[PDB]
Amino acid sequence: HHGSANKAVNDFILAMNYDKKKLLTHQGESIENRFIKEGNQLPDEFVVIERKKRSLSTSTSDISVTATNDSRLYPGALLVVDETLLENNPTLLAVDRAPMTYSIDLPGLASSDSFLQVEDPSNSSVRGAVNDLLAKWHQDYGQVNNVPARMQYEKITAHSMEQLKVKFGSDFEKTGNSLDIDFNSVHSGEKQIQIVNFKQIYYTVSVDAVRNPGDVFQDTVTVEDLKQRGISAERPLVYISSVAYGRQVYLKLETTSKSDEVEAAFEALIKGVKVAPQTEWKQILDNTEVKAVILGGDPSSGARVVTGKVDMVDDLIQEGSRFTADHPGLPISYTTSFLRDNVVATFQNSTDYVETKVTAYRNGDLLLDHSGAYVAQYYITWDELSYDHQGKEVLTPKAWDRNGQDLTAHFTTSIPLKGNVRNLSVKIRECTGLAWEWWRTVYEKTDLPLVRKRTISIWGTTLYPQVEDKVEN
C-alpha cells in the first residue's frame, strides 16, 4: 500500500503460477488382494471372512482440528502450502502483519458491531478481541434463552486406520490411537466397528476477501524476506479465511455381534430417546456393546478420553448442546483461501483399503431323548465345511459314534455342531416286534437346518410311536 516494497511483494504473489489441485492432493496406497481368502476357525460361532477391496476419495475445504492450544490456527493466519499443510501441521508465516477485519456470526448483533478490528493479528490479539465480545453478548444474551448449538454428525464403519484419515483428517492418530481400536480383531472377523464424529458449533469467525496480496503485510516486509522463508510458486500461501468454534466428539463403537442389521442399531440409538422394549435384536446388540469416546471442547485444555457402555448412559451428546458464553468453545474446523485470488483451497485426499466383510452361521446343538417302550436306532450323518486355499471349499463328511447302536430305556445325549456343519441327515427307526415289518422309520429329514437347539424326542409304544421335532432359535 503505497510503499515500493509492499508493491513489489504484491507483484510477486499475483505473478505466481501453480496447480491448485496438484498441490492439495496427499496419498496413501493400493496393492490389490485378488479378493480370495474366505475361511476361518471360530469360538462360539463360525464365520466366513472374504476380503473385497474398495476405494475412498474425499474432497473438502473444511479441515477438522484435534488441537486446542494450537497457536497457529487463527483466522487471518498465513500458512505455507507444502507437505505439512496436507498433514495438518502447517508451516506458519509469521511476518509483520497488517490489520484485519473479522466478522462473527452469532445472534444478538446481526450487523451492528458484529465486526472487529485487530492491529496485529495473532492467536492472542484475535482471541482477546473475541473474548471481549463474548462478554457483552453474555451481557445482552446467552442468558436470554438456550442459544442452541448447530450439530452435524458423520459416520464411517471402520476397515483400516489410514482409510479413516481420509474421512476425518490427515491427522487422526492422536485421536485414533486413543479410542483403542483393534483391526487385528476385525480382519479376524471378530469385532466389527463404526466411528462417529459429532460436531457442535457455537459461533464462527471469518475474513472478508483480501483485495490485494500485499494488503496482508506491513511495509516492512519484502520479497527477499519471503524468499528467505521459502515462498515460491512451488510453495504459495493461503490464509485462514474461516474458523468454526465449538465442541467435538469422536466416538467409536464395537460389538461382539455380526447381524447384518447392526448399522440400524446405532442410527436409531444415536437418535437418543429411542429406547426399544428389551427382547429385541436391535437391542441385544447394544447390550453386548462397549465404547470409547473423546471430547475436544467446552472446558478448554486437552481431551477427555472416556468409556462406558451405552445403555444410553453415555449421553454426553446433549452435554454441550446449549451454548451460552459460560465457557467459550475451542476451534473445531477451519477453511483456507489462496492469497493470490481468494479461491478456497480444496483438498483431495485418497486411499483404497483392506475391506473385510463377514457372514453369520451361529452354532447350536442337536439333542436326542428316547423315552420309548421299544428299541431304536439313529443314523446321523453330516458334512463339515472349511476353506483351504483359493477358498473354494472343503466338505469332509462325518457321522455319529452311535450309528447302528440299539438304544432303549431313557437315552439322552447332546450332539453339538458348529457353523460350518452342512448336509446334516437324520434317520430314526424303531423296532416293532412284528414279523413282517421289523422297522418303522419314524423320522427322516434331509438337510436339517442348523439351529441354536433342535431337540428330537421319540416316545410311545411299538405300534404307536410319538415324535416331537422341536426347534428353539
Residue numbers in the entry: -2 to 470
Text taken from the publication that reported this structure:
Pneumolysin (PLY), a major virulence factor of the bacterium, is a pore-forming toxin belonging to the family of cholesterol-dependent cytolysins (CDCs). PLY is produced as a water-soluble monomer and recognises mammalian cells via its C-terminal domain (domain 4) before assembling into circular prepores of ~30–50 monomers on the surface of cholesterol-rich membranes. The monomers in the prepore undergo critical structural changes, including the unfurling of two alpha helical bundles (α-HB1 and α-HB2) in domain 3 in each monomer that are then refolded into β-hairpins (transmembrane hairpins TMH1 and TMH2) for insertion into the membrane, which is facilitated by a structural collapse towards the membrane surface. The resultant PLY β-barrel pore has a diameter of ~300 Å that causes lysis of the target cell.
PLY adopts the canonical CDC fold with maximal dimensions of 123 Å by 20 Å by 49 Å. The most significant difference between PLY and the other CDCs is that it adopts a linear shape down its long axis whereas the other CDCs tend to be bent to various degrees due to different orientations of D4 with respect to the rest of the molecule. A significant difference, not observed in any of the published CDC structures, is the high mobility of regions of two strands (residues 29 to 35, 46 to 50) in D2. Consequently, the hydrogen bond interactions that D2 forms with both D3 and D4 that are typically observed in SLY and other CDCs are absent in PLY. Two gold cyanide compounds, used to improve the quality of the crystals, are bound to Cys 428. In one site the gold complex packs against Trp 435 and Trp 436 and the other packs against Tyr 461 from a symmetry related molecule. The Trp-rich loop in PLY D4 (residues 427 to 437) adopts the same conformation as that previously seen in SLY and SLO, despite the binding of the gold complex to Cys 428. The monomers in the crystal are tightly packed in an elongated linear arrangement. The buried surface between PLY subunits is extensive, with more than 1500 Å2 buried in the interface (750 Å2 from one monomer and 770 Å2 from the second). Thus it seems the linear oligomers observed in the ILY, LLO and PLY structures are glimpses of the very early stages of weaker monomer-monomer interactions required before the interactions become strong enough to drive the conformational changes needed to induce circularisation of the oligomer.
